[PDB]
Every structure is written in C-alpha cells, then in structure tokens.
Amino acid sequence: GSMQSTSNHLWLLSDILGQGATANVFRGRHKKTGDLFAIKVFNNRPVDVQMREFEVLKKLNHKNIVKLFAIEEETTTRHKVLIMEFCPCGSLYTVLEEPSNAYGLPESEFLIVLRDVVGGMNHLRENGIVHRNIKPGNIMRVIGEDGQSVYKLTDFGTEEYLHPDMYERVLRKDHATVDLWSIGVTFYHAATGSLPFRPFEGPRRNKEVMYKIITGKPSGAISGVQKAENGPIDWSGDMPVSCSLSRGLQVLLTPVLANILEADQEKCWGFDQFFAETSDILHRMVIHVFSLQQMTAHKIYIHSYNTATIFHELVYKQTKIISSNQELIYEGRRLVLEPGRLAQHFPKTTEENPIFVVSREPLNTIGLIYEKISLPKVHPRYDLDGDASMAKAITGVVCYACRIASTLLLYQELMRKGIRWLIELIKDDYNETVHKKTEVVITLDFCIRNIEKTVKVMEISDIHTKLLRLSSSQGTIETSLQDIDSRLSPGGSLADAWAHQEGTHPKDRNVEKLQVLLNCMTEIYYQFKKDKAERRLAYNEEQIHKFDKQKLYYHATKAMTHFTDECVKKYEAFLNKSEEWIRKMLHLRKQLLSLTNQCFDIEEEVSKYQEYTNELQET
Amino acid sequence: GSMQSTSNHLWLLSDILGQGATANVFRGRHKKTGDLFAIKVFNNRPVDVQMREFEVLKKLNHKNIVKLFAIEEETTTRHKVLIMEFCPCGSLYTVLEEPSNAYGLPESEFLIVLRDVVGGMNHLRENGIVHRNIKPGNIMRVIGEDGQSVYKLTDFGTEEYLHPDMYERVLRKDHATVDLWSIGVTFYHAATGSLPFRPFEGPRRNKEVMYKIITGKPSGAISGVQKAENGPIDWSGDMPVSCSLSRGLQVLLTPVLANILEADQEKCWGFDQFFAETSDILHRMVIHVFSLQQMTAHKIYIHSYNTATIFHELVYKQTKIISSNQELIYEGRRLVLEPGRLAQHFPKTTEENPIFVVSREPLNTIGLIYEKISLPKVHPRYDLDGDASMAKAITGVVCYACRIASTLLLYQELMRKGIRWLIELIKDDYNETVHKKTEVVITLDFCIRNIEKTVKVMEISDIHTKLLRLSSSQGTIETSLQDIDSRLSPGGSLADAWAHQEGTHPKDRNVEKLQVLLNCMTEIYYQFKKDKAERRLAYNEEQIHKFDKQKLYYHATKAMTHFTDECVKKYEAFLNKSEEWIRKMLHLRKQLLSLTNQCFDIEEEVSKYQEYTNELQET
Ligand SMILES: O=C(NCCCNc1nc(Nc2cccc(CN3CCOCC3)c2)ncc1C1CC1)C1CCC1
Ligand SMILES: O=C(NCCCNc1nc(Nc2cccc(CN3CCOCC3)c2)ncc1C1CC1)C1CCC1
C-alpha cells in the first residue's frame, strides 16, 4: 500500500485512525527513530489563520490534552500536516464499545474519566479555548506509566451530544454552558453505557422526537426514554438499576448531571460551579462499609478532613441506621471512632475488607438489587452489520450477569466473615458480663455471710431477706446465661454452620465458569466486528459465521441458566437463611444486654451494704 | 491455500499444529458443524496392525488423555486419518515458552500439571499401554469449563528427556521406569523453567557431556549444570533459588524427583510407589502461615485428616519454632487450636489472609530470599533467530523481577497487618492483667484494713509488715504497667507509625509500573517470535526490528532500576526497621508476663490471709 510522507515522518494510508470533514488522522512513524505518532492531514483559507492557531496548540502543555508536537510539510503536496501524540488505546468510544461496559464503566474508571475530562476542560478555559463538541470519540485514552488510564482531549476547533440549541444548528450566536451539555451526555453515557435521551429506534431516525424530548424535559430529570414507537417518554432523575456505580457516588453524580443537562441555559450551572462541584467529588476518599443486617455494601465518599460524626451521617443516609445505633467492626474487632477523628486517620478499607456496621434495632435484609436482563432474540437472517450489533448486545447481557454473579458471591463472603466476627464479639460480651457476675457473687456471697459471722461473735432479718432475694436473683441470671452460652455453642440456635452450607463459595468457581463462556462469546463478537468491516465473506467464512451465530446463543443460554439456576437460586437461599439468623442474633444480644444490666444493678446494691456492716463504736 | 479432506472434515495445510516422523497434525473442521478438530495424517505396514491399534485408542476415555474420535479416509488418497480432540491452548511446551514461566510455573499450575500427568500416566498403565517419551510437547493443555487448565497426554506409540539407556538408543531391551525419567525431567522443567541436566552450551552440542552428567550423577542429586566450557558440573539435590514453588511443596517434590531421576533402575522407584508418593502430595490441602518475626510466608501441606499436633510439627520444620512456642493469630484474634483438631476444620486461609505465627523466643528476621538476576547483554548483531531468543530471556528476567516485587509488597502488607493485630493482642494482655491487679488491690487494700477494723472494735505486727510489703510490691507493679502502657501508646517505643512510613505500599503502584514496562517488552518479544518464523524482513520492518531491539533494552533497564532502586531498597529499610521493632516487642511482652505472674503471686498470698482473719470462738 502507498504511503504519504514528510521529511521526518511517513504513514500508510491503510493505518487510518480517524476521519473528519476537515482532516484525516493516520498512524505513522518518525523516520529516524521509528516512534509512533498520529499524523493529521488537512484536505483543502486564509493561509495564516491556521498557522497561527497551529502555534497556540503547540504551546498547550497538559496531561489531559493530546500533545501537538510539530507542524511539517507533506512531501508530494506542500500541504501542512500536524504530528500529534499517538494514543494506542483509542478513545472513550473504543472503551464504551466493549461488551463489558455495555451497562457503564467500572466505578474506578468512571472516576478517571470524570477527573481527566474536567482537568482538560478547565485547562482549555484557563487558556480561553472552547471545545464546542466533546464526545467519547474526542476523548483519547492512554495507559499511564502506573498502568492507569489517562484521558486526553483532542480535535477542538455529534447529534446525540449536541445541545438543544446546537441540535437545531444562527452561528451559535456569540459570547461555555453548551459544552457542559455534551459533557453531561458523555458522563451519563460513561456511567450507564447508554445515551440519556433516546427516541424509539434511533435519535437520527427521529431527529424531531429527540428535540422534543430534550426541550420538554422536566427539570431534575437526567434521562428520557421512548420505549415503544410513538409512545410516551419515561423520564428519570435517577440512574438505571443496571448502573454499576455505588449509591454513594450516584448520590453525588446525579445532581451534577441534572444541573448541566438543563435546557434553559438561564439555569444552567456555569463552569466555575461545575468545576467546584466536580472537584468536590474527585477530592473525596472512599471508605468501604458493609451493612451486615441489610446485606449491602456501601462506598462512603468523605473528605480526608471530615470527622467521624460526618462519617456516621453519611452511613445513616445509605442505611437509615442513626449514628447512635451504628456499631462498627473491623478486622475481627469492634471499631470505636471518636467523634472528631478525621477520615484520613480511619483504618484502611477495600470492598473485600470493609468496616462492618451492625445495629441493635431491626432492619430489613435487602441484599443486592440488580436488573433482571434476558437475552435478546437472535435474528436468523444473516447480516454482517446486524449480527455484529447483536453479538455485542448478547455478550453485554452475559457480562452483566457475570458482574452480578461476582457481586453476589462477594456479598455472601462478606456476610460469612461479618457473622463470624460478630459471633466472636457477642461471645466477648457474654464473657465480659459472666466475669462481672462471678465477680459480684464473690462479694455478695461473702457479705451475706459476713453478717452471720458477727452474730456468732432487735432488723438484720430485713437485710437477709432482701439479700437472699439477690442470690435468688443471681440464680435466675445463671440459668439465663447458661441458655445464651448454649445458643452460642456449636449446636446453638445461633450457629454458623448454615452459612457454610448455603449459597455459593469461591471453590464453586461459578464466576470462572461464566467467564469461560463469556470468553467464547467475546471471541465471536470480535470476529463479527472483523466480519462487518470486511463487507462480504467467502462461502466458507460465511457458513462459519452462521455456525458461530448459533454458538453465541448456545453459550449465552448456558451462561444465563447457570446464573439463574445456580448463582441466583443459592444466593436467595443464603439470604433467606441470613434473615432468620439476624433475627435470632438481635434477640440474643437483647437478652444478654438485659442480663448485663441486672448484673450492674445487683452489683451496686451490694456495694451499699458493704459499709453498712460496720457501726460507729464508743471510744 | 490448498486443503485436504475426508467425507466429514477438511483442513488447510497452512494450519499445521505438529509434525512427527510418522504423521502430521493439522487443525481442521467438521464440514457439517464447523467444529474444530485435530486431524492426524500418516505419511507412508502391515495394514491392519494399525487399524487395530487405532481401535484401542478410540476406546480410551479419560480426562487426561486427548480423545480420539474417529478414523476416516482422506479423499484424494485412501489414506487413513485420525480425527482427534483439538486443544486450542497447545502444549506444556507452549506454556513453558512464555517469558513469565522462564523460572518455573506458578505453584497452582504446577500442581495441575503434576495431577494431570499422573492421572494420565496411571490410566495408560491401567490399560497396559506404555508412553515411551513423555515431554512438554506431548502434554496438551485445554481450558476446563471452570477456567482451570486440564492437561492431556497424546502421541503415545527427545534428547534432553531420554533416559541414559534410552539416550544411548538394543531395542530398549524388552519387559515403565524409563517413562518415570522423562516424567522427572518434565516436572523439573515445569518447576524451574530449565532442564535439570545441562552441559555447557546445549545438550545437542555436547551429547557426550550430557551422557556423562547423567550416568556419573551422584544419588540424591536432581540436577547437574556445567557453567563454563569444559568446566566441572555443579550438582544439586535442591531446587534453584529462582524457583517459585513454596518450601512446603519443594520439600515434598524434591525426594520424588531424586528417586525417579535415578540412573541405576535397580533403585528407581517403580510406578506404584511413584503413584503413591505423588498422590500423597496431590491429596494434601494447603494452610497459609506467615511467620511474623522471620518475615516469611509459608504453605503447609497437610492432610484433611491430620491433627493440629501434626500441623505444629510441619510449622516447626519450616520456621524452627517448636510447637509449644507457636502462638497463632487469625483475623485479628488469637487462634487456639486443640491438639486433635483436624486440618479440615481449621479456619480458611489464603496467602493474603494467613494464620500468623509468633514466638516469645528470639528469631532472625529473614524476609524473602530470592535470586539476584541481571539483564543479559544485547548482541547488536541483527539476527532473527538470536534476537527472538534474547527477547525471551531479557523479558524473562524482568518478569521474575516483577514477581519478586509483588512478593516483597505482599510480605510488607502482611507484616503491617500482623503487627497491627499483635499490638492489639498485647494490649488485651495489658488490660487483662491490669484488671486482675486492680481486682486484687480491692481485696488486699480491704483486708489490710479489716485487721485494724477489729483492733478498734500479744503478732499482727508480723502480718502488717509482710502485707504492707505487698502494697509496696503493688506500687512497683503500677509504675511498671504505666511504663508499658506508655510504650503501647501512640508516642510509645512500640509504635506502629514507622510501618506506614517505611517500605512500599499498594498506592505506590510499583508492581503496575513494572507490568507496563513488561507489557511493552512482551509485545516486542512476540513480534520477534513472528519475525523469526518469517525468514526475512523487508527493509522497513528490518529497521523497526532493530529499533525495538534497543527499546527492549531501554524498557528492561528502566524496570530493573525501578526494582532495585525503589522496590528493593525500601523493602530492605522496612525489614531493618521491623527487626528492631520485633526486638522491642519481645522485650515488652517478656516484662508484661513478669508483671502478670507477680499479680498472681500477690493474689494467692492475699487469698490466704482472707480466712486467717477469723479465729475459732468459744461456744
Ligand atoms: O482526532 C480526531 N478524531 C478521533 C481521534 C483520531 N485521533 C487519534 N487516534 C489515536 N489513536 C487511536 C485512534 C483510534 C483507534 C485506536 C486503536 N487502534 C487499534 C488497532 O490498531 C491501531 C489503533 C487508536 N491517537 C491519536 C489521535 C489524534 C491525535 C489525537 C479528529 C477527528 C478527525 C481528527
Ligand atoms: O500430537 C503430536 N504432537 C504435538 C501435538 C500436536 N497436536 C495437537 N495440537 C493441538 N493444539 C495445538 C497445537 C500446537 C499449538 C496450538 C496453539 N496454536 C495457537 C495459534 O493458533 C493455532 C493453535 C494448539 N491440539 C490437538 C493436537 C493433537 C490431537 C493431539 C504428535 C507429534 C506429531 C503428532
């Protein structure tokens, strides 16, 4: 294949990375080093209006802006080319096309996108530039030297991302907020895998319905979807259930989207507010909490300099457990946080190693709430464009099922761990009061006798009668403690055994079994992606394509069956069993507490007769 | 490209999987389904001597034997082809060629290899078959439905793997043990990434030196390496330091290899013993233990039905901490194992969540012992065969550095966790004795007074003088406890802070930084693998190959520098700091114990004068 060139670079025309009305982008090399670069070639002012604007871009130095290195002349034409930083990974679009991102980015990746888009935007503004159309295709991805994605803006200076005024397309007036809109759509797309505003069929098919959805949108709504043809619009101010972002993050993100997806730019946020509100999210650290009675994991987004008081409030918001009722467990022991303890001084947590919260007050066992998504039907009609689109969708469904399977397993593993720890904690309490009791018996049983000690050496009868009631009261405690110990023992009604008998375990390798099926589906999907780009298949490759179409469905059905019949069913049995075990536990702790307070009441009444034994003497 | 065929199958001649003197193996498809199969075509008794042997193989049904499905006639020739199970992953050879396996398989994979080879071998024997030459190329890998490798034997009925009698090449006499030899070599290769018997240069280059090494091999040795030309042989009965297998596994594997790599078949093990000894390994479960004072992780290979007594003995073997001195910690709390408790009833562990062992007796802080491996020099001479070989080696070195970096980080993370837990445990002890003390003060300070109580109501002077010494003795305890509490406090000499200040942390992302560099090296390695197979490169591809040769070295140097300067240096500082913190801790626990025993001594002497207060009375 032929290639163009300049003094320092050359590039195959086959290795094209991007195509715009203004220019083409190819992947090329430095002739002398061999290093990869993106070559931007313009097809066609006044002459120096661009040479100037080329210069300003060369000056821009920021982590979140794709770098413009040099401006050279192509060899065959004297036309200007731009040598720009090559981004091997591609764009946010590339990422969002992965079947595993069909329902939104993983939370960690979403946060990098949020951070980098925001930092890039701000840098432009800081230099006076406006990037009229941000979109996943504009947002380039590179692997940072620490293995983390870095997102970088390029091509500054589409329908689904255009503002309602921009979607109409008068010069966009003249002076921005319009940029916040495509940012809003972009962030929603990244969070959910879908566009927020969706006419039935496609936006392009119904340009008019799309405009109606966006202008007639009620304030606060962040999405509007038409599910049937010519049907009404389902509005929402919330993220879809299928979104993977934590409730903690959803609660912060939602208001931002709502306030930058606002039609009347009168009430749009403006950049500075947007920058403040997004930075406030980005600057928060995350503390992982697991609600043991609700069977729910939580991410608490809290500032380094925030107190435990604020932490408790944030936990109440997600659990509805008031601060005073929040009992914390971490790495096998109670965690007691002083009110003014800064979050940066909290113990380190992960999703696998969270702080557990428990309450002495009854709570509904919730578990994981997720979307029930079935396989789309597979259209038997051979079609390279349709099949690749379908392959993506059905693989996307199985990926989601796999992510849920993983979360379900995690929830069960955390449950088992928290329960194990809580039982040991309760046992400490049982042992703490049992010492306290035996400790007061030793003085009570001693002082009850010390009275008669003097008699052998007229009212005392009134002292013995009230006291012998205490020993009798202590007999009632003994038998009740023996009953609690009995329940905490291996055969006890608060036994652990069921937790190892119910649900699913790592050794079951359910996640891995599903991943294997997913991997088969993903290979076929990518091949279909190849088959689409190649317009026609030869007879053999055609049949093989049709065979694997059936194989896709076969793999998907097998996965879903395993997921529902094995993963979900056993999870729901474990959950139902947990719910009863929780109920018993609360009842036991409540009875134990009562026995403990009785031990304190008895102890102090005995600490009163200890002195009343000795009278004043004549001397 | 042309393809051969049969009624049911067809295959490109380009898609060849394997080549033997007897037959070729291609990757083909069922014509009607499209399903992949291995087609084995024979090039050439008597006629039915093979039709019979083909039939016996068709009957063989085992997980660890590659399946023979059918025997069909090719279309152009009436020649017999075998349709066999296609193994998408390839062979153990394929696996061992990966740069990340240059120093042996990961322990988990090695165990699957051990299991599957053994199960396959046994199945053959159970049917009377002998597989004269097992080798990594004979051992096929498939992904099991649970995502785990399954290894399968094929091609039954090389130099480095041949027995000394076989290496000579008289009909191999007639009747096996000879098979155990290539099994021995294979397992050693899998464990270490290298052949056990290595003349200088290559075995093929020095067929004579190789035979000398193997026959003149002293008993017990499992390897023999000639490091210089015409130089002596370094024998070893142990695994190389660079081996990744745990000491626990190494201790069991080594004797097996030594006894099946035995020259004189007089003293070779024989199959049944081999099957017993290997099964005994495969049937053991693993308990992860971390020695906190030695800074060493351990895998304890123990039977389900073994007792804690046996467990302690196994731990002593790897740590040299006698049973009685072994103090166990798990998930933040002491673990007390009853002597007869079966290992299957132990708490579940992983490398990340081990049982910690500590001792009140001094131990040398060891840390991780690993091989210091430097980069090979890169030969500037362009050579497709040499460069691909070199690329593999240098990438192999960086992978090893990456695995070590990971283990070093883990060791530090475990240290930090164990220390954190131990400090809380010591604090419990401090609080347990402090209650005990105040508890006896309340009776001592009471009974010291109860004496004078009677006087106000001739020898007592002898009672007060011994007793006032006890209160004085209790004053000496109080001040000593206040000194221990002081050390356990945030400013205390047993502070935790250094552990968060020294070494490296997950947030440093050192492992990930190295992985990125490794990924760049691995892409180039695979391209070189492609460049080798293609005999010559065009001018451009040639230069690019030479450029990336320099890039390989650049990436490797950067990685090693980061590893030594950042990972290793900070690890060694953390280790040195740990060593002193351990020393203090032992001293503190020793002083605390002493204060605790004094609290018991005082307590019982006071529990004697409690009754001696009251005399017999006339009545
Ligand atoms: O830049 C634009 N649009 C989208 C981005 C095309 N640009 C790039 N793509 C890339 N990389 C890239 C683009 C698309 C796909 C991929 C992934 N491919 C996988 C297969 O092997 C080739 C890379 C990589 N790097 C840099 C750039 C230019 C300098 C900013 C403007 C619209 C036409 C110009
Ligand atoms: O079987 C023999 N030698 C080595 C194994 C060749 N056989 C196979 N290879 C495979 N798979 C395989 C072999 C080599 C490489 C690979 C990996 N390739 C990666 C690139 O895409 C094609 C597969 C896969 N499957 C089955 C078989 C035969 C039925 C037992 C005997 C020696 C010649 C016959």
PDB file of all heavy atoms in Angstrom, chain B residues 375-391:
ATOM      1  N   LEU B 375      20.216  -8.355  33.719  1.00  0.00           N
ATOM      2  CA  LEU B 375      19.906  -8.456  32.301  1.00  0.00           C
ATOM      3  C   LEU B 375      21.073  -9.078  31.556  1.00  0.00           C
ATOM      4  O   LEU B 375      22.231  -8.759  31.835  1.00  0.00           O
ATOM      5  CB  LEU B 375      19.615  -7.069  31.723  1.00  0.00           C
ATOM      6  CG  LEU B 375      18.495  -6.298  32.420  1.00  0.00           C
ATOM      7  CD1 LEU B 375      18.322  -4.920  31.807  1.00  0.00           C
ATOM      8  CD2 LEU B 375      17.200  -7.088  32.366  1.00  0.00           C
ATOM      9  N   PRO B 376      20.778  -9.978  30.605  1.00  0.00           N
ATOM     10  CA  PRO B 376      21.817 -10.422  29.673  1.00  0.00           C
ATOM     11  C   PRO B 376      22.233  -9.256  28.784  1.00  0.00           C
ATOM     12  O   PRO B 376      21.483  -8.290  28.647  1.00  0.00           O
ATOM     13  CB  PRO B 376      21.108 -11.501  28.844  1.00  0.00           C
ATOM     14  CG  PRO B 376      19.655 -11.200  28.983  1.00  0.00           C
ATOM     15  CD  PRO B 376      19.492 -10.653  30.363  1.00  0.00           C
ATOM     16  N   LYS B 377      23.420  -9.322  28.200  1.00  0.00           N
ATOM     17  CA  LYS B 377      23.822  -8.284  27.266  1.00  0.00           C
ATOM     18  C   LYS B 377      23.108  -8.502  25.938  1.00  0.00           C
ATOM     19  O   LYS B 377      22.835  -9.639  25.547  1.00  0.00           O
ATOM     20  CB  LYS B 377      25.340  -8.260  27.084  1.00  0.00           C
ATOM     21  CG  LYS B 377      26.097  -7.786  28.317  1.00  0.00           C
ATOM     22  CD  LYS B 377      25.709  -6.362  28.698  1.00  0.00           C
ATOM     23  CE  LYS B 377      26.358  -5.939  30.011  1.00  0.00           C
ATOM     24  NZ  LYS B 377      27.846  -5.965  29.941  1.00  0.00           N
ATOM     25  N   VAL B 378      22.784  -7.410  25.260  1.00  0.00           N
ATOM     26  CA  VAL B 378      22.110  -7.497  23.974  1.00  0.00           C
ATOM     27  C   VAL B 378      23.114  -7.431  22.820  1.00  0.00           C
ATOM     28  O   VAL B 378      23.825  -6.436  22.651  1.00  0.00           O
ATOM     29  CB  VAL B 378      21.022  -6.409  23.829  1.00  0.00           C
ATOM     30  CG1 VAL B 378      21.538  -5.057  24.313  1.00  0.00           C
ATOM     31  CG2 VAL B 378      20.522  -6.334  22.392  1.00  0.00           C
ATOM     32  N   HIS B 379      23.173  -8.509  22.044  1.00  0.00           N
ATOM     33  CA  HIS B 379      24.085  -8.614  20.909  1.00  0.00           C
ATOM     34  C   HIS B 379      23.596  -7.732  19.765  1.00  0.00           C
ATOM     35  O   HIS B 379      22.547  -8.002  19.186  1.00  0.00           O
ATOM     36  CB  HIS B 379      24.170 -10.074  20.448  1.00  0.00           C
ATOM     37  CG  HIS B 379      25.341 -10.370  19.563  1.00  0.00           C
ATOM     38  ND1 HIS B 379      26.061  -9.386  18.920  1.00  0.00           N
ATOM     39  CD2 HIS B 379      25.921 -11.545  19.218  1.00  0.00           C
ATOM     40  CE1 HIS B 379      27.033  -9.942  18.218  1.00  0.00           C
ATOM     41  NE2 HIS B 379      26.968 -11.251  18.381  1.00  0.00           N
ATOM     42  N   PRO B 380      24.361  -6.677  19.430  1.00  0.00           N
ATOM     43  CA  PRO B 380      23.971  -5.711  18.394  1.00  0.00           C
ATOM     44  C   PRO B 380      23.759  -6.357  17.029  1.00  0.00           C
ATOM     45  O   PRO B 380      23.046  -5.797  16.196  1.00  0.00           O
ATOM     46  CB  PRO B 380      25.171  -4.759  18.329  1.00  0.00           C
ATOM     47  CG  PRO B 380      25.846  -4.902  19.647  1.00  0.00           C
ATOM     48  CD  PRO B 380      25.661  -6.339  20.032  1.00  0.00           C
ATOM     49  N   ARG B 381      24.374  -7.515  16.805  1.00  0.00           N
ATOM     50  CA  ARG B 381      24.252  -8.198  15.522  1.00  0.00           C
ATOM     51  C   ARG B 381      22.817  -8.643  15.256  1.00  0.00           C
ATOM     52  O   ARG B 381      22.290  -9.529  15.929  1.00  0.00           O
ATOM     53  CB  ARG B 381      25.214  -9.389  15.430  1.00  0.00           C
ATOM     54  CG  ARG B 381      25.098 -10.187  14.136  1.00  0.00           C
ATOM     55  CD  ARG B 381      26.278 -11.132  13.959  1.00  0.00           C
ATOM     56  NE  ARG B 381      26.045 -12.114  12.904  1.00  0.00           N
ATOM     57  CZ  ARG B 381      26.312 -11.913  11.616  1.00  0.00           C
ATOM     58  NH1 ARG B 381      26.823 -10.759  11.211  1.00  0.00           N
ATOM     59  NH2 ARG B 381      26.066 -12.870  10.731  1.00  0.00           N
ATOM     60  N   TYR B 382      22.201  -7.992  14.275  1.00  0.00           N
ATOM     61  CA  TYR B 382      20.871  -8.338  13.795  1.00  0.00           C
ATOM     62  C   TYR B 382      20.804  -9.822  13.452  1.00  0.00           C
ATOM     63  O   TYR B 382      21.567 -10.308  12.620  1.00  0.00           O
ATOM     64  CB  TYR B 382      20.554  -7.483  12.563  1.00  0.00           C
ATOM     65  CG  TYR B 382      19.262  -7.806  11.842  1.00  0.00           C
ATOM     66  CD1 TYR B 382      18.126  -7.029  12.026  1.00  0.00           C
ATOM     67  CD2 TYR B 382      19.190  -8.866  10.945  1.00  0.00           C
ATOM     68  CE1 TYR B 382      16.950  -7.314  11.358  1.00  0.00           C
ATOM     69  CE2 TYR B 382      18.020  -9.160  10.279  1.00  0.00           C
ATOM     70  CZ  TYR B 382      16.904  -8.381  10.485  1.00  0.00           C
ATOM     71  OH  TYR B 382      15.739  -8.674   9.814  1.00  0.00           O
ATOM     72  N   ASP B 383      19.891 -10.535  14.100  1.00  0.00           N
ATOM     73  CA  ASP B 383      19.709 -11.963  13.854  1.00  0.00           C
ATOM     74  C   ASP B 383      18.333 -12.411  14.342  1.00  0.00           C
ATOM     75  O   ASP B 383      18.078 -12.450  15.545  1.00  0.00           O
ATOM     76  CB  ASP B 383      20.812 -12.775  14.538  1.00  0.00           C
ATOM     77  CG  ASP B 383      20.603 -14.274  14.409  1.00  0.00           C
ATOM     78  OD1 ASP B 383      19.923 -14.704  13.452  1.00  0.00           O
ATOM     79  OD2 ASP B 383      21.123 -15.025  15.263  1.00  0.00           O
ATOM     80  N   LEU B 384      17.462 -12.761  13.398  1.00  0.00           N
ATOM     81  CA  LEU B 384      16.075 -13.111  13.698  1.00  0.00           C
ATOM     82  C   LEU B 384      15.935 -14.248  14.699  1.00  0.00           C
ATOM     83  O   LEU B 384      15.064 -14.214  15.568  1.00  0.00           O
ATOM     84  CB  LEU B 384      15.314 -13.449  12.413  1.00  0.00           C
ATOM     85  CG  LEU B 384      15.108 -12.261  11.478  1.00  0.00           C
ATOM     86  CD1 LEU B 384      14.089 -12.578  10.400  1.00  0.00           C
ATOM     87  CD2 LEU B 384      14.686 -11.039  12.279  1.00  0.00           C
ATOM     88  N   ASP B 385      16.794 -15.254  14.577  1.00  0.00           N
ATOM     89  CA  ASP B 385      16.741 -16.395  15.479  1.00  0.00           C
ATOM     90  C   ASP B 385      17.304 -16.029  16.850  1.00  0.00           C
ATOM     91  O   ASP B 385      16.736 -16.390  17.881  1.00  0.00           O
ATOM     92  CB  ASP B 385      17.501 -17.580  14.881  1.00  0.00           C
ATOM     93  CG  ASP B 385      17.082 -17.880  13.452  1.00  0.00           C
ATOM     94  OD1 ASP B 385      17.530 -17.157  12.535  1.00  0.00           O
ATOM     95  OD2 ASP B 385      16.307 -18.839  13.243  1.00  0.00           O
ATOM     96  N   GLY B 386      18.419 -15.304  16.856  1.00  0.00           N
ATOM     97  CA  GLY B 386      19.077 -14.927  18.093  1.00  0.00           C
ATOM     98  C   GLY B 386      18.286 -13.916  18.898  1.00  0.00           C
ATOM     99  O   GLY B 386      18.137 -14.055  20.115  1.00  0.00           O
ATOM    100  N   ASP B 387      17.772 -12.902  18.210  1.00  0.00           N
ATOM    101  CA  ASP B 387      17.044 -11.817  18.852  1.00  0.00           C
ATOM    102  C   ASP B 387      15.779 -12.305  19.540  1.00  0.00           C
ATOM    103  O   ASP B 387      15.494 -11.910  20.671  1.00  0.00           O
ATOM    104  CB  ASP B 387      16.719 -10.721  17.835  1.00  0.00           C
ATOM    105  CG  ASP B 387      17.952  -9.964  17.382  1.00  0.00           C
ATOM    106  OD1 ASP B 387      19.073 -10.371  17.751  1.00  0.00           O
ATOM    107  OD2 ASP B 387      17.802  -8.963  16.650  1.00  0.00           O
ATOM    108  N   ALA B 388      15.029 -13.170  18.867  1.00  0.00           N
ATOM    109  CA  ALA B 388      13.820 -13.740  19.459  1.00  0.00           C
ATOM    110  C   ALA B 388      14.163 -14.531  20.719  1.00  0.00           C
ATOM    111  O   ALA B 388      13.431 -14.502  21.710  1.00  0.00           O
ATOM    112  CB  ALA B 388      13.093 -14.617  18.450  1.00  0.00           C
ATOM    113  N   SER B 389      15.289 -15.231  20.672  1.00  0.00           N
ATOM    114  CA  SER B 389      15.785 -15.986  21.814  1.00  0.00           C
ATOM    115  C   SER B 389      16.209 -15.047  22.939  1.00  0.00           C
ATOM    116  O   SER B 389      15.947 -15.309  24.113  1.00  0.00           O
ATOM    117  CB  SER B 389      16.972 -16.851  21.387  1.00  0.00           C
ATOM    118  OG  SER B 389      17.531 -17.542  22.488  1.00  0.00           O
ATOM    119  N   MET B 390      16.871 -13.955  22.565  1.00  0.00           N
ATOM    120  CA  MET B 390      17.321 -12.954  23.527  1.00  0.00           C
ATOM    121  C   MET B 390      16.133 -12.205  24.139  1.00  0.00           C
ATOM    122  O   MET B 390      16.064 -12.025  25.356  1.00  0.00           O
ATOM    123  CB  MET B 390      18.306 -11.980  22.859  1.00  0.00           C
ATOM    124  CG  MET B 390      18.738 -10.802  23.738  1.00  0.00           C
ATOM    125  SD  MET B 390      17.573  -9.412  23.762  1.00  0.00           S
ATOM    126  CE  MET B 390      17.545  -8.995  22.013  1.00  0.00           C
ATOM    127  N   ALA B 391      15.212 -11.764  23.284  1.00  0.00           N
ATOM    128  CA  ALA B 391      13.998 -11.073  23.715  1.00  0.00           C
ATOM    129  C   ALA B 391      13.273 -11.860  24.791  1.00  0.00           C
ATOM    130  O   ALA B 391      12.782 -11.298  25.773  1.00  0.00           O
ATOM    131  CB  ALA B 391      13.076 -10.847  22.534  1.00  0.00           C
TER     132      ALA B 391
END
